[PDB]
Amino acid sequence: AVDIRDVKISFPGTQNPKFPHLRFMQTLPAVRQLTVCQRIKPFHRNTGYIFSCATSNQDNQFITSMYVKSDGTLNLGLQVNASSNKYISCPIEIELGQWYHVCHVWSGVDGRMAVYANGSPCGTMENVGKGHQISAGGTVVIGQEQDKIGGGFEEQESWSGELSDLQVWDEALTTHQVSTVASCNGIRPRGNVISWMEDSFVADDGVIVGISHMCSL
Amino acid sequence: AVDIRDVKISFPGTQNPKFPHLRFMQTLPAVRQLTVCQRIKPFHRNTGYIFSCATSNQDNQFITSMYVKSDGTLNLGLQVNASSNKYISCPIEIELGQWYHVCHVWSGVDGRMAVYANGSPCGTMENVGKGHQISAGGTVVIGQEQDKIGGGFEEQESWSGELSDLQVWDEALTTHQVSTVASCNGIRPRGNVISWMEDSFVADDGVIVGISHMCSL
Amino acid sequence: AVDIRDVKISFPGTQNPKFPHLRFMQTLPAVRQLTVCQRIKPFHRNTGYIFSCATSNQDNQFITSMYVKSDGTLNLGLQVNASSNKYISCPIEIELGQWYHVCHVWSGVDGRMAVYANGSPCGTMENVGKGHQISAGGTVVIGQEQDKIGGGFEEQESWSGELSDLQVWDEALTTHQVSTVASCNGIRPRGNVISWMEDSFVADDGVIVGISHMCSL
Amino acid sequence: AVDIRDVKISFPGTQNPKFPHLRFMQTLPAVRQLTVCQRIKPFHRNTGYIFSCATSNQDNQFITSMYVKSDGTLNLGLQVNASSNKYISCPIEIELGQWYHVCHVWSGVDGRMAVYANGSPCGTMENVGKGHQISAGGTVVIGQEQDKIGGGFEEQESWSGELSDLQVWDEALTTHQVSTVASCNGIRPRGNVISWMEDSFVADDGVIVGISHMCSL
Amino acid sequence: AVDIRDVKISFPGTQNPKFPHLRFMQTLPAVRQLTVCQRIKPFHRNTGYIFSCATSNQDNQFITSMYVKSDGTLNLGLQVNASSNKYISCPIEIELGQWYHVCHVWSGVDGRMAVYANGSPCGTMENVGKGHQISAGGTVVIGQEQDKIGGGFEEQESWSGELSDLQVWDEALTTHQVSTVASCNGIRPRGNVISWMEDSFVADDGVIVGISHMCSL
Amino acid sequence: AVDIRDVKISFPGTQNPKFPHLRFMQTLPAVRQLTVCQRIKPFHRNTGYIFSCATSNQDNQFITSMYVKSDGTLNLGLQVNASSNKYISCPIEIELGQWYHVCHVWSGVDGRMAVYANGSPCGTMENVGKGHQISAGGTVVIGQEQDKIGGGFEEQESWSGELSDLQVWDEALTTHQVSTVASCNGIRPRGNVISWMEDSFVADDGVIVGISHMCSL
Amino acid sequence: AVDIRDVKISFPGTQNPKFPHLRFMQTLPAVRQLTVCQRIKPFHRNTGYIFSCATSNQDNQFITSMYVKSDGTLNLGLQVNASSNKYISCPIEIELGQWYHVCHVWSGVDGRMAVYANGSPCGTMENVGKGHQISAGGTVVIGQEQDKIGGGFEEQESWSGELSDLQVWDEALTTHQVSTVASCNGIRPRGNVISWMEDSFVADDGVIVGISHMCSL
Amino acid sequence: AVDIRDVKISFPGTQNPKFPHLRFMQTLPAVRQLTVCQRIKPFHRNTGYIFSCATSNQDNQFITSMYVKSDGTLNLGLQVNASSNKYISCPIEIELGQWYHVCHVWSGVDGRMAVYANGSPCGTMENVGKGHQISAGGTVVIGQEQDKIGGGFEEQESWSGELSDLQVWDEALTTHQVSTVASCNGIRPRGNVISWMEDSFVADDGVIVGISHMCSL
Amino acid sequence: AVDIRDVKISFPGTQNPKFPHLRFMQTLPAVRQLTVCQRIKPFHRNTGYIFSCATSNQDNQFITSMYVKSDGTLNLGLQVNASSNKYISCPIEIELGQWYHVCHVWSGVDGRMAVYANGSPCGTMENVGKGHQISAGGTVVIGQEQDKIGGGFEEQESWSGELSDLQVWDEALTTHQVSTVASCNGIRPRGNVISWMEDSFVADDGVIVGISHMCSL
Ligand SMILES: [Ca+2]
Ligand SMILES: [Ca+2]
Ligand SMILES: [Ca+2]
Ligand SMILES: [Ca+2]
Ligand SMILES: [Ca+2]
Ligand SMILES: [Ca+2]
Ligand SMILES: [Ca+2]
Ligand SMILES: [Ca+2]
Ligand SMILES: [Ca+2]
Ligand SMILES: [Ca+2]
Ligand SMILES: [Ca+2]
Ligand SMILES: [Ca+2]
Ligand SMILES: [Ca+2]
Ligand SMILES: [Ca+2]
Ligand SMILES: [Ca+2]
Ligand SMILES: [Ca+2]
Ligand SMILES: [Ca+2]
Ligand SMILES: [Ca+2]
Q: From which experimental method does this structure derive?
A: X-ray
Nearest-CB residue to G204 (from H6, H198, H204): H204
Which chain F residue is nearest to residue D215, measuring alpha carbons? F177
Give which of F50, F78, F24 is closest to F197, Cα–Cα: F24
Of C51, C77, C79, the closest CA to residue C193 belongs to C51
Whether the CB-CB separation of F4 and E1 falls below 8 Å is answered with: yes
In a 3-state reduction of DSSP, which class is residue G207?
Answer: strand
Which amino acid makes up residue A137?
A: G
Rounded to whole angstroms, how far apart are CA atoms I42 and I46? 10
d(CA H135, CA H148): 16
Please list every residue in chain B whose beta carbon sits closer than 8 Å to the beta carbon of residue D198: 192
Closest residue in D to B198 (Cα) is D192
DSSP per residue over A73-128, as a string? EEEEEEEETT-PPEEEEEEEE--TTS-EEEEEEEETTTTEEEEEETTEEEEEE--S
Please state, as a whole number, how many other Cβ atoms lie within 10 Å of the Cβ of residue D215.
19
Of C25, C30, C200, the CB nearest to F25: C30
G144 near G25, Cβ under 8 Å? no
User: Sign of the CA dihedral D194, D195, D201, D203?
Assistant: positive
Helices (H) and strands (E) in chain F, counts: 1, 15
> Is the CB of residue E178 less than 8 Å from the CB of residue E36?
no
> Is C217 in contact with B177 (Cβ distance < 8 A)?
yes
The stretches of chain A forming alpha helices (DSSP H) are 175-182
Map chain E to HEC letters: CCEHHHEEEEECCCECCECCEEEECCCECCECEEEEEEEEEECCCCCEEEEEEEECCEEEEEEEEEEECCCCEEEEEEEECCCCCEEEEEEEECCCCCCEEEEEEEECCCCEEEEEECCEEEEEECCCCCCCCECCCEEEEECCCCCECCECCCCCCCCCEEEEEEEEECCCCCHHHHHHHHCCCCCCCCCCCEECCCCCEEEECCEEEEECCCCCC
In eight-state DSSP terms, residue I84 is P
Residues of D in contact with A213 (CB under 8 A): 169, 171, 173, 177, 192
- A-chain residues within 8 Å CB-CB of H96? 107, 109-110
Residues of D in contact with C201 (CB under 8 A): 208-209
For strands G120-125 and I120-125, give the pairing. unpaired
Q: Which helix (H) or strand (E) holds B175?
A: helix B175-182
Nearest to B27 among D27, D192, D200 (CB): D27
DSSP class of residue A5 equals: G
Q: Within 13 Å, how many C-alpha atoms sit on residue I119's CB side?
A: 11
Residues across chain G: 217
**Secondary structure element (H or E) that encloses residue A207, with its range:** strand A207-211
H-only helix segments in I37-89? none
Q: Could you tell me the sign of the dihedral formed by the alpha carbons of A40, A42, A46, A50, in that order?
A: negative
Distance CA F136, CA F57 (A): 11
Residue B111: CA count within 13 A, CB half-sphere = 10
Cis peptide upstream of residue A17 (ω within 30 degrees of 0): yes
Q: Exposed/middle/buried for C81, CB within 10 Å: 0-12, 13-18, 19+?
A: middle
Partner residues linked to B211 by β-bridges: B7
H134 C-beta neighbours (distance < 10 Å), count: 25
- Specify whether the CB–CB gap between F161 and F42 falls below 8 A: yes
- In chain E, what is the straight-line distance between the N-terminal and C-terminal CA atoms, in Å? 12
Whether the CB-CB separation of I102 and I114 falls below 8 Å is answered with no
CA geometry: angle at C163 spanning C157 and C164, to 5°? 145
Q: CA nearest E2 in C: which residue?
A: C192
Q: Which helix (H) or strand (E) holds G176?
A: helix G175-182
| Distance from the alpha carbon of residue H79 to the mean position of ligand 15, in angstroms | 10
Phi, psi of A181 (to 5 degrees): -80, -35
- The rounded distance, in Å, linking the Cα atoms of E105 and E84 is 17
For chain G, which chains pass the contact test of at least 3 CB pairs under 8 Å? A, B, H, I
Instruction: Determine contact, residues D87/D73, Cβ cutoff 8 Å.
Output: no
| Interchain proximity A211–D192, CB inside 8 Å | yes
C-alpha of A55 from chain center: 17
Instruction: Report helix, strand or coil for I179.
Output: helix
* Total CB pairs under 8 A between chain C and F: 25
Alpha carbon distance B164, B144 (integer Å): 16
CA distances from I204 to D148, E105, F188 (A): 107, 103, 89
End-to-end CA distance of chain D: 12
Cβ-contact H134, H34 below 8 angstroms: yes
CA distance F4 to E2: 6
Q: Report the candidate in F32, F31, F58 with the shortest Cα–Cα distance to residue F149.
A: F58
Resolution (A): 3.0
Q: What are phi and psi of D171, to 5 degrees?
A: -130, 155
The b-or-e profile of A59-91 (16+ CB within 10 A means b, else e) is: bbbbbbbbbbeeeeebbbbbbbbeeeebbbbbe
CB contact under 8 A, H26 and I25: no
- Half-sphere exposure at residue D168, Cβ-oriented, CA atoms within 13 angstroms: 25
DSSP for G14-55, written as a single string: -BTTB--EEEESSPB--BSEEEEEEEEEE--SS-EEEEEEEE
Contact status, residue F200 vs residue F25, Cβ threshold 8 Å? yes
CA–CA gap between residue E138 and residue E157 (Å, rounded)? 19
- For residue A16, what are the CA distances in angstroms to A20, E66, F72? 10, 95, 87
D48 CB contacts (<8 Å, ≥6 apart)?
Answer: D42, D65, D66, D67, D157, D158, D159, D160, D161
d(CA E129, CA I100): 95
Report yes or no: E95 at the C interface, CB cutoff 8 Å.
yes
Distance CA H9, CA H41 (A): 10
Chain A contact present for D109, CB below 8 A: yes
How far is the CA of D205 from the CAs of C23, C144, C196, F29, in angstroms?
A: 12, 16, 21, 18
User: Does C149 contact chain D (CB < 8 Å)?
Assistant: no
Is F166:F5 a contact under the CB 8 Å cutoff? no
Q: How would you label F190-211 residue by residue, b for 16+ Cβ within 10 Å and e otherwise? A: bbbbbbbbbbbbbbbbbbbbbb
Q: Which residues have their alpha-adjacent CB atom under 5 A from ion ligand 3?
A: B 59-60, 147
**Strand, helix or coil for residue G149:** coil
- In contact, B163 and B38? CB cutoff 8 Å: yes
Residue H70: exposed, middle, or buried by beta-carbon count in 10 A (0-12, 13-18, 19+)? exposed
Q: Tell whether D213 lies on the interface with F, counting CB pairs under 8 A.
A: yes
How far is the CA of I194 from the CAs of B49, I10, I133, I186, in angstroms? 65, 19, 18, 19
- What's phi and psi for F10, nearest 5 deg? -115, 130
Residues from chain D contacting residue A95 (CB–CB below 8 Å): 110, 112
**Alpha-carbon gap, residue H3 to G203, rounded angstroms:** 21
In three-state secondary structure terms, B4 is helix
Pairing of strands B7-11, B207-211: antiparallel
Dump the DSSP string for D171-194.
Answer: S---HHHHHHHH-SSS-----SSE
| DSSP secondary structure letter of residue A198 | T
Rounded CA separation F210/I99 (Å): 89
Our CA-based measurement puts residue G95 at a distance from the nearest CA of chain I, in whole angstroms, of: 8
Inter-residue contact B21 to B140 (CB < 8 Å): no
CB A38 within 8 A of CB A163: yes
Which is nearest to B141 in space by CA: B128, B132, B154?
B154
Distance CA I33, CA I14 (A): 31
Residue type, H172: A
Nearest by CB to residue E97, choosing from C33, C187, C192, is C33
Give C65's strand partners.
C49, C77
Nearest to D51 by CA among D172, D159, D174, D141: D141
Nearest to H202 among G2, G3, G206 (CB): G206
C-alpha distances (whole Å) from I97 to each of F68, G104, I42, I181 are 109, 54, 6, 22
What is the distance between the alpha carbons of residues E48 and E178, in angstroms, rounded to a whole number? 23
| CA gap I26, I33 in Å, rounded | 18
Residue type present at position F48: G
* Burial group, residue D142, by CB count within 10 angstroms (0-12, 13-18, 19+): buried
**Ligand that lies nearest to the alpha carbon of residue D149, given by its number in the listed order:** 7
User: Is the CB of D95 inside 8 Å of chain B's CB atoms?
Assistant: no
> Across the strands, what pairs with C210?
C8
I29 touches chain H (CB under 8 A): yes
G217–I110: do the CB atoms touch at under 8 Å? Answer: no
Contacts of B175 (CB under 8 A, 6+ apart): B114, B116, B121
Amino acid making up residue G4: I
Burial of B145 (0-12, 13-18, 19+ CB in 10 A): buried
Structurally, what CATH architecture does the domain formed by C1-217 represent?
Sandwich (2.60)
Measured between alpha carbons, how far apart are the two ends of chain C, in Å?
12
Distance CA D22, CA D159 (A): 12
Query: Do H and C touch, counting CB pairs below 8 Å (3 needed)?
Result: no
Q: Are C9 and C202 in contact (CB under 8 A)?
A: no
Burial pattern E12-21, b for ≥16 Cβ within 10 A else e, equals: bbbeeeebbb
**What's the per-residue H, E or C state across F96-109?**
CCCCEEEEEEEECC
SS3 of residue I67 by DSSP: strand
Cβ distance F28 to C29 less than 8 Å, yes or no, reads no
Using a CB–CB cutoff of 8 Å, tell me whether C1 touches chain B: no
CA distance I56 to I149: 7
Residue B189: C-alpha distances to residues B37, B181, B182, B185, B186 (Å)? 11, 6, 9, 11, 8
* Helix (H) or strand (E) segment spanning residue I176: helix I175-182
User: Buried b vs exposed e over G125-152: b needs ≥16 C-beta within 10 Å?
Assistant: eeebbbebebbebbbbbbbbbbeebbee
- Spatial neighbors of A72 by CB under 8 A, at least 6 apart, are A93, A94, A95
